Amino acid sequence: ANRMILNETAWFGRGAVGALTDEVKRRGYQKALIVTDKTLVQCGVVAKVTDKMDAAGLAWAIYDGVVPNPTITVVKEGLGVFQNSGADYLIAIGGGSPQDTCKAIGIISNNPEFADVRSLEGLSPTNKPSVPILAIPTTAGTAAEVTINYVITDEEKRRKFVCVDPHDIPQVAFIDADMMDGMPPALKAATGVDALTHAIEGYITRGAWALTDALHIKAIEIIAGALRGSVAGDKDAGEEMALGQYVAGMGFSNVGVGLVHGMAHPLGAFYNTPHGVANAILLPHVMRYNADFTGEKYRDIARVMGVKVEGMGLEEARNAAVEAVFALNRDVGIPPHLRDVGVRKEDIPALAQAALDDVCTGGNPREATLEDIVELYHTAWTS
Amino acid sequence: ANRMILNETAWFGRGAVGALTDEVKRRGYQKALIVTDKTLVQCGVVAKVTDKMDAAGLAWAIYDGVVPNPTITVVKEGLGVFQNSGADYLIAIGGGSPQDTCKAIGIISNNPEFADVRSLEGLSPTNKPSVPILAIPTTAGTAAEVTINYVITDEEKRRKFVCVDPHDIPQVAFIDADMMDGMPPALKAATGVDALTHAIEGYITRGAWALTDALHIKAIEIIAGALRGSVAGDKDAGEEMALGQYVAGMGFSNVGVGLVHGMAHPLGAFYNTPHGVANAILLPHVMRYNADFTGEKYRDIARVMGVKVEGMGLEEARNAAVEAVFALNRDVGIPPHLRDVGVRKEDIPALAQAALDDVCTGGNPREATLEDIVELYHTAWTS
């Protein structure tokens, strides 16, 4: 039997954050800790929420120390602020980095045996639910608002570790493209192909079943249809991307992903490479490696990505699916090689071993050897 | 902005009730009240749950007084049992009738100013969440396990009233076809076409949007694909039906239905007509009425029900959707006319006023008049 964890409540559309003050009053919460980053404060995205809270007379404090690929140190800093704030709930404003930091703070506040942070890795044996979290994404992006995962960087051990825990699921998600419009086009592109990686890896993962298949192929269709338009600055395409990224999460949270995520995590740990850019570069290479273990699923992918599949045999449709991803990466200006974003040739053996050991790698439909991964890194390295 | 309420936790597949004892221990609950009907106790369906609970040492009491189209009296009697039981949670075992009774008991128990039951009608102004509900459907299905609605019969006033409350959402749904195999074929047929009615009405409802459209069209594809096989007693078809009826609820709970539900409720109240039979008989007649107000949606319906729409103009595709529902109804042995199920011609004026005043009617893509509804009851009445 298959489990699904989802948000009990989610609001979708431009103006969705408009529902937040009423959700807070109905729940009877007294004071928020807002978990975010300095950029979101600096650009006025956090004010879009706090101005509404002030108008409704709701108490809040703020922690804005979150950095990309958030570290054990960032979690402990935000824990200290939460525990000294007297807040009874959390509001996560931002991408994967603040949302994952917020999940770690909420879990530890109600489960103090785990306050060292690294002991949360894997299926966290938590006794108690998280401090309640209201989750507000600002990237079109990670679906952290709907997943049971969070990823923290262990700086001492040079590794990203995955914490999987139904106790961390947000009580409410607010998916509001008004919070996302300020993303630079390069960030829309990187978070957009991250969402596409989620959708494609989830579609072909080993745990895949009828319900996740239906969410994944819809997510692929929405994202492939909208990403070029959203990068270009189309307001409607931005609204489509906000939904697409979420629908992908509803699936992959519950069944898993594969080798793209497994290979992208070590790049994050070694070089602080943005998650989206690493995923985007690796995706078409990993799809080519997986092609023969995906049944007819690349023909569905090719179709929803606008390839004419009427005539094509399955082998041509598989190759056309991979070429559709190459062409999308080109079109939204993702760098084509790992060397371009600060990877070292010398590191690939260590990267390959960290990828083989990464939990995400287990979901890959083709059994990955150390030797295959080494070769996959070399292929994405350069011409 | 559009809201979605869903189950936070759901288990799917034959054996899913296997997960119940672990879920209870992790939540720390001390004592269940099981809400069910005498048929489900007698047939050994409730024993599929209680034998696992007895083996794990989990305490339970039972209220088995639920009747089809549950009444104010069934709610008040169940409430009395829950209060005297010392139970701290509810397990709903059955179709829409016990699941709707269980929602009512759980709400009133934590919001005792509603113990009259009548005052719950509409958007219930409840301050507290329901007593925690674990929901186990035995039909395929009303999707009551994942909706925020419950329907009670007021005997004194000869009317079914709809209670809509996010506070009533079950904490866990267990969707296990092993709990549904014992349905007689005629019960599989009627609850199956009720699920189809949910999916088709939800697909074309005024409030419809991108996410509910994706859920509803997948539900129609699954249900139209499986129902004949399930009624005929195919094991896999039964498992597909369990999933399809649920996916239908994920959508229609959040956006609404239409005139089929509006015209079915008064038949329930006047004659105690089974909900699924009334919907099955009315569905194709209301689809024919609505056809011009559904854009290209009947082409999608016709395609996923196995009609070859490639050549067809829109008028042939719309007719093809209607005829495919008439054909499914005949194939699974649903009676074609309301006269066959105990409706009286004399009552049609009173039924039509009840239907026009029903909350579900407001969702219909075509604005219904009293005269249009009278004409629709006559058309479904006889040859």
Ligand SMILES: NC(=O)C1=CN([C@@H]2O[C@H](COP(=O)(O)OP(=O)(O)OC[C@H]3O[C@@H](n4cnc5c(N)ncnc54)[C@H](O)[C@@H]3O)[C@@H](O)[C@H]2O)C=CC1
């Ligand atoms: N929880 C899960 O299941 C998953 C976790 N992740 C994690 O999420 C992280 C990546 O998160 P992302 O959302 O890609 O980025 P991020 O949260 O790391 O932010 C990247 C940068 O964009 C800025 N930014 C974000 N929204 C902005 C906006 N609206 N306008 C202007 N600037 C904005 C941020 O301040 C930051 O400098 C990684 O640590 C990754 O491992 C990724 C996917 C799955």
Ligand SMILES: NC(=O)C1=CN([C@@H]2O[C@H](COP(=O)(O)OP(=O)(O)OC[C@H]3O[C@@H](n4cnc5c(N)ncnc54)[C@H](O)[C@@H]3O)[C@@H](O)[C@H]2O)C=CC1
């Ligand atoms: N809450 C909601 O969103 C919705 C509410 N409803 C309500 O649900 C009710 C209809 O519920 P249904 O599930 O159609 O029927 P039901 O729960 O009224 O059951 C009909 C009969 O079938 C029997 N039965 C149930 N499961 C069985 C099994 N596995 N084996 C043998 N017999 C079995 C029951 O004992 C009963 O005698 C109506 O009151 C309707 O208004 C219907 C749809 C949506």
Ligand SMILES: [Fe+3]
């Ligand atoms: Fe990712």
Ligand SMILES: [Fe+3]
């Ligand atoms: Fe119904």
